[PDB]
Amino acid sequence: ADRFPPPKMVATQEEMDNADIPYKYRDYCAHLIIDFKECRYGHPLTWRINCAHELHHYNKCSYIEFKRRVAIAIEEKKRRGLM
């Protein structure tokens, strides 16, 4: 946990509230989810084709966060001695 420090949080409380982002989605990727959300709602039926850049960017950030979570897990497991 300490070795892999959290990333800086680009999104502020005011922006997350203004974009109506639930608390669960405020996970260091909220700025990208705001971009994706605004684009998906802007294009109600054509988002799948049009809004693909934002989804890609969110998925990439999510991937990096997932890798961090796995790293934290491995570090904790090594500290406890299980592996």
Of residues 41 and 53, the one with the C-beta less far from another protein: 41
Q: How many residues does the chain have?
A: 83
Give how far the C-alpha of residue 10 lies from the chain's centroid of Cα atoms, to the nearest Å.
Answer: 11
The distance from CA 69 to its chain's CA centroid, rounded to whole angstroms, is: 12
Taking CB under 8 A as the criterion, the residue among 10, 48, 50, 53 binding another protein is 48
Asked if 4 and 72 count as a contact pair (C-beta separation under 8 A), the reply is: yes
The residues of the shown chain that bind another protein, judged by CB under 8 A, are 1, 4, 6, 9, 13-15, 18-20, 23-24, 26-28, 34, 37-38, 40-41, 44-48, 55, 58-59, 62-63, 65-74, 76-77, 80, 82
